[PDB]
Every structure is written in structure tokens, then in C-alpha cells.
Amino acid sequence: SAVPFHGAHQAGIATPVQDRLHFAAFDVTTEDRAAFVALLKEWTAAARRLTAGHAVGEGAYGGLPEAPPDDTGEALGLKPSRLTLTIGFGPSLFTRFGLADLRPEALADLPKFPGDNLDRARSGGDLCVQACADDPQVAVHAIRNLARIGFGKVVVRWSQLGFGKTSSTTPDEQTPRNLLGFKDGTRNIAGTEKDRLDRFVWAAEKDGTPWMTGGSYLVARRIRMHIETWDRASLQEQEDVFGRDKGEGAPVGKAKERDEPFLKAMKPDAHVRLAHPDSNGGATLLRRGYSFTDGTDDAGLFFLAYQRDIRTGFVPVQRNLATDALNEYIQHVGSAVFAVPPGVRDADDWWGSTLFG
Amino acid sequence: SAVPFHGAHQAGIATPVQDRLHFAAFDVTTEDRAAFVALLKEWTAAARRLTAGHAVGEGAYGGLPEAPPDDTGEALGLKPSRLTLTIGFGPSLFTRFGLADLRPEALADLPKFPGDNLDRARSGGDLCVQACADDPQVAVHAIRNLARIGFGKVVVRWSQLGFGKTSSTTPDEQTPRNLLGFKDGTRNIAGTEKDRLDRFVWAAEKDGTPWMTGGSYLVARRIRMHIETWDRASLQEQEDVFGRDKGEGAPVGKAKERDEPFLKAMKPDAHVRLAHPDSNGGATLLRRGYSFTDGTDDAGLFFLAYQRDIRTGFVPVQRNLATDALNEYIQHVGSAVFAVPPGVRDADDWWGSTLFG
Ligand code: HEM
Ligand code: HEM
Ligand SMILES: [Ca+2]
Ligand SMILES: [Ca+2]
Incomplete structure (x- = not known):
């Protein structure tokens, strides 16, 4: 446990x-x-x-x-x-404690994205x-x-x-569903894919910031879903939005959830077609988000993505989502980035020990 | 399941x-x-x-x-x-659909209570x-x-x-803990106590409202906890507030959670001493609340109480809580009452059938 x-x-x-x-x-x-x-x-x-x-x-x-x-x-x-506790340091932390020169270049401030309506009090x-x-x-x-x-x-x-995961690092296990009713996490990165983790998730010393070696970079986005309008869309419209069918979660033209997608069979504005690494120069994310509900005007996805460099992970993928058909049914309303340090090595180590010394 | x-x-x-x-x-x-x-x-x-x-x-x-x-x-x-879905009708419903004469007398509007800061948008x-x-x-x-x-x-x-229950209708089972760290639900009403349910929870035809027979009346209170100050109180202060110890949950002077309390051994402003039926002319509630967290200024107890008549259940108990030591650490910030109709008798019945006809 x-x-x-x-x-x-x-x-x-x-x-x-x-x-x-x-x-x-x-x-x-x-x-x-x-x-x-x-x-x-x-x-x-x-x-x-x-x-x-x-x-x-x-x-x-x-x-x-x-x-x-x-x-x-x-x-x-x-x-x-199975409790885990993961700590991360935001850009604003580095203005304190004489830390300025230790801010990682890979900890890049996010650009503005079309459609953003970021609540500053729920950001950073x-x-x-x-x-x-x-x-x-x-x-x-x-x-x-x-x-x-x-x-x-x-x-x-x-x-x-x-209140419920919308992500997976265990592809052989049942993929969970998000509030739009679709399986979410089919094509991610598995805990067992060490090479892909090394390539796409963990910072390396040669990247430029030695204290961040073995760490990763986190992007958080609070994404509201327009539930009322989504629920009145046809099944076909919903499926066209993603590029996968709703029940099985198979890509267009395929039989099973885990069949590899043929991207050009999807709508040119389909979410998966736009987000897939092949469409983004090979850029790949470890998504680890959860659904939320927060009373009324109010529900959606608390999106979490880990990557080796924000500039080569979340940023180009999100940019490619500018024409995403999904955009009609979602809005980003909160945002934060964090440098997530390497692990606590033993019983004498401590969170942030590589940064503070 | x-x-x-x-x-x-x-x-x-x-x-x-x-x-x-x-x-x-x-x-x-x-x-x-x-x-x-x-x-x-x-x-x-x-x-x-x-x-x-x-x-x-x-x-x-x-x-x-x-x-x-x-x-x-x-x-x-x-x-x-174990999903259940329970419907209830608020006082304001009876201004519609020609229902005015069917509003139960036992569905009484709550009086104002000292310390209330009710958000109207999250009430009613x-x-x-x-x-x-x-x-x-x-x-x-x-x-x-x-x-x-x-x-x-x-x-x-x-x-x-x-996110977690703070109540119990199953006294033999483990009593859950609320956000103040105390067992909550020790002395309530059990699903098996049919006589107590008939006496204290279910409306009877002779009470005055025939369509409500087999129904009950619900009070909801959103109660914020002052967590920061509570967490800096001593263990003894916390225990004095309730009249029970924190670990075992035993009443003052007793050894076990379920030992009956001797009320006069508690502080005169102790929660249990003030809320107990003996202190309230025999008034007794079925509490069924849950803890919540709702971001920041923000957590507490979403209090739920069922009773045969709001005037002889929640109202006199809450009034007696005017001097409750707990008041230093809580504030009621939302409120609603509902008449909860009798059950759906069979596959052809429908919610509200006794009210609408
Ligand atoms: C509420 C917002 C979103 C919802 C409901 C959503 C839902 C989905 C669904 C159903 C899939 C297909 C199943 C899967 O392979 O995981 C998917 C795939 C994916 N999404 Fe999203 N997504 C959202 C936002 C985002 C954002 C903001 C990004 C990145 C900036 C993103 C990046 C990806 C990636 C990289 C894939 C895998 C594509 C592939 O390689 O096949 N998603 N998403
Ligand atoms: C955040 C607010 C509250 C907290 C943390 C709280 C907590 C507790 C705790 C720890 C107990 C003792 C264990 C038990 O027997 O259940 C208790 C008992 C009780 N409470 Fe509360 N309570 C709260 C509000 C209320 C309110 C608003 C009412 C009614 C208006 C109420 C009525 C009662 C009653 C009737 C008992 C059982 C007393 C007995 O018969 O021994 N409580 N509560
Ligand atoms: Ca289209
Ligand atoms: Ca005192």
C-alpha cells in the first residue's frame, strides 16, 4: 500500500x-x-x-x-x-535567498496562449x-x-x-476517464520506459543546471470544461474532436484502444492529431492530471505535465493546439510552472538539498 | 456493492x-x-x-x-x-406549480443564529x-x-x-475523523434502530402533512473551520472543547469511545455536553455530514442533519450551541433546508409522486 x-x-x-x-x-x-x-x-x-x-x-x-x-x-x-509527496520550486522562488543565478534556463515562463483567461490568484x-x-x-x-x-x-x-485521475503511467492497466467521458492516458509515458523517461522527463547534468539533475519540470494548467455545450454535442462530434471513438477509445480506423493511430485519418483539427509527438518534432510529455469540480459559475481538468525542458515539451505542443477542435469546449483559467528537484537520496537527505547546498 | x-x-x-x-x-x-x-x-x-x-x-x-x-x-x-441518490424540496419550491398549500409546517425556515455569515449564493x-x-x-x-x-x-x-465522511449510522464500525482530528459520529442514530428512526427521523401522517409520510427533513450547513488557530491550540484545549479525548474519543472520565458520557464531568461549554439529547429536552438528530476543502480564503464540515421536524431537531440543538466553546473555531457560512419525500416504492413510482399526485 x-x-x-x-x-x-x-x-x-x-x-x-x-x-x-x-x-x-x-x-x-x-x-x-x-x-x-x-x-x-x-x-x-x-x-x-x-x-x-x-x-x-x-x-x-x-x-x-x-x-x-x-x-x-x-x-x-x-x-x-500509495501516498506520494512531490515538491517543486516556482520561478518566483529564485528572487529570494540569493538564488537568482540558480534559476534553470529550462524553467521558462510560459508565453501567452490564445484563449487564455488566467486567474492570477490561482496561478503561480x-x-x-x-x-x-x-x-x-x-x-x-x-x-x-x-x-x-x-x-x-x-x-x-x-x-x-x-477527485479522479485522468492520466496513466501504467499502459497495461485500465485507462481512466475524464469528465468528457473519454479514456485519457492511453499514449503517455510508462513508469517502466526508462529510456523514454531519460529522454523526455528527467533533466540531465549536461542540460545546463547541475542541481536539477534527476529532477523534472512541471506545468500545471487549470482547464475548465464547457460541460453544458459538450453534453449537447453529438457522439460523432465528440469523437471527431479527439480522433478516437468514445467507448473503445480506438483511433479512427482501428479496432482497439492501444492500436497505434494513423494520424492523417483524423480530422486536421483533432486533438490527438495535433498533440501527437509526430506532429510536434518528436516532442513528448508525461501527463499526470486529475479531474476537478469546484461548485458553480465549474468543472474540468487540472492538467499536469512533466518534461525535461518546458521549451521542448509543453510549449510547442500547446502552441500546436491553437487550432484544436477541443478549444470550443475548454478554457485555460490557471497556470503555474515549477522546477521539481531530484529525489531524497536517503534518511539524512532533504527536499531542495541540491539547490540550497 | x-x-x-x-x-x-x-x-x-x-x-x-x-x-x-x-x-x-x-x-x-x-x-x-x-x-x-x-x-x-x-x-x-x-x-x-x-x-x-x-x-x-x-x-x-x-x-x-x-x-x-x-x-x-x-x-x-x-x-x-454503494451510490445513493436522495432528493429533497426546499421551501422556495412551494411558490411554484400551485404547491403553496402543500408546504409542510415542519419545513420551517431557520432562525438567524449568532455568528452566522451566510453566503446567499451558496444557500437555499x-x-x-x-x-x-x-x-x-x-x-x-x-x-x-x-x-x-x-x-x-x-x-x-x-x-x-x-471528500470524506464525518458521520456514522453504523456504530459498531470504525467511526471516521473530521478535519479537527476527532472521531465524529459516535453517538448518532443507527440504521438498525427502527424505533429511534420512527421517533426522531421519519415524518408520520399524524404530524400534519400526509404526502411527507415516510419522508424526513434535512438541514444543510456549510461550516468553515478556523484551521490555523485550531492547529495552535493545545491538545488539552482541543479535548476540553468537545468533552471527549482525541485518540480514543472517550468522554471525560471514561475509558472507551462508546462508553456513555457523564455530561457534568465535561466543561459547561463543551460541545457534547451542549448537544446531547439530555441537554435539549430529548431532541436527537441523524447527522450525516462530510468534510470539505475549497481552495483558499477554506475548509471545514458540510454538516447534514435529518429529523422528523426541524423545529424539534436542529433548531433547539443549534440554539443550545450558542455558548459552545467550538464556536471559537468554526463559522456557519451556508445554509439550506429541504423536505425529503418518502421513497420510490417500485419500478413505476417516481420522485415527488406523493407531492405532485
Ligand atoms: C481538458 C483538456 C484536455 C482533455 C479533455 C484531453 C483529453 C485527451 C484525450 C482523450 C486523449 C487521447 C487518449 C490519450 O492518448 O491520452 C489525449 C491525448 C493527448 N493529449 Fe490531451 N487533453 C486535454 C488537454 C491537453 C493539453 C493542454 C495538452 C498539452 C499541451 C495535451 C496533450 C496531449 C498529448 C501529448 C496526448 C497523446 C497524443 C498521442 O501521442 O497520441 N492534452 N488528451
Ligand atoms: C464543524 C462543526 C462540528 C464539528 C467539528 C462537530 C464535531 C462533533 C464531535 C467530535 C462529536 C462527538 C462524537 C459524536 O458523538 O459524534 C459531536 C457530537 C455531536 N454533535 Fe457535533 N460537530 C459540529 C457541529 C454540530 C452541529 C452544528 C450540531 C447541531 C446543530 C451538532 C450536533 C451534535 C450532536 C447531537 C452530537 C452527539 C451528542 C451526544 O448525543 O453525545 N454538531 N460533534
Ligand atoms: Ca469539424
Ligand atoms: Ca474553557
């Missing part, structure tokens, strides 16, 4: 995609670099307990009566639930923590407790619950 | 509490009574399929290419997941559907599809995802 926390890479990327998400972007509120480093170490200690299904610190109760408990207690009695962030688990209360508890530990040093800028 | 949809009562009340919730309040946008009745019948048909784990209508695909699919498809491949509603399931995507899919079918006749006014 538990995913190993330590490794050369952070878990929660190549890892099998868990059912639920709680994602939080944080802003830094302290200018004390030593104190922020202390926080990262204590966060890392908490993450080891959390991902093993243990309460933070000395637990949720049984401590001194006059002291606040170490763990807030809402995960008591639940399982590890000095850092992020991605909490993925099969039990949403386990994920929320992890974020909440990290936020508690960080009180006075960081604040939650924005946060997003994903 | 499936809960029976038909019965003398609607499921989703006395039923074992499922892990997740999607709750939606709807406003009626049509003045055509016959068309609204037609909608209720089609909603009921959908509910039978949904609760059995089947797609609505003729399914999510395989229909005529030029027609919108009958089911939006996002629950394909998932299980019934002509009707509600409570979708409870162990899989949140199953619940969301049910609500979404009901909303789709109702297009042009109803609109979603507000909706609320509950």
Missing part, C-alpha cells in the same frame, strides 16, 4: 498514477534563508512519516496536554494509500507540493499538515482537489 | 454512510408543471440505472452518431460503489440531490448527469464535494 519515498528521483512522477490528488501552491513569507532550510528538513521528515502512513512527529495525541499535537489527526485509521506560486493518494483524505491530510508545519514561513496561495 | 434504490423511505439517510459526497442544490427555471413532473420521472429512471452502476438511458456510446449520448460516460468502468435552493458513494467520481457523475437531463428546466444553484 506504500510507495518508497527515497530515490534518485522524487516519487509521484513516473510512479503509477494514484486515484486522487490534493495540489497546493505555496508562497514564501520569510526572508530568513536558514529558517527556510530548516523548514525543508522538517517537511522532509514529515513526508517520510506521511508516505509510510504514520502520523507526523510523535503523533496526533498522547503528548503533553499543554502542547499542540504534532499531527492534526484526520488520517488516523487510514492506510498509506513560489513552490508546490503534489499529494497523490488513492484516498483523498490521506492526500488532504498531508497537505494540511505540511501547511501547519510551515506556518509563519509559507502560506497556501492556491490549492486544488482532484 | 449496490444499495437498493426502492423502499418505503429514500436510501441515503438510514443507509450506512458512504465515504464520499457530491451534494447539489438546484433552482427550477421552468413554470410548466407538467414538464417538471416529466423531469422527475426521467430523473427517477436515471437514478435506478445510476445506483445499479449502469449508464443512463441506452448508455454512453453506441447510439446514433448524430445524437448526444444518453450518459456522459465518466463512470464507465467504475462500480456501483428549490431542491437538492444528495449523491453519496465510496468513489467520488461515481457521485459526481450522478449529479452531472441529472443536471444534464434537467437542462432548460433546472440549474445548479450551488454544489459541494465532500
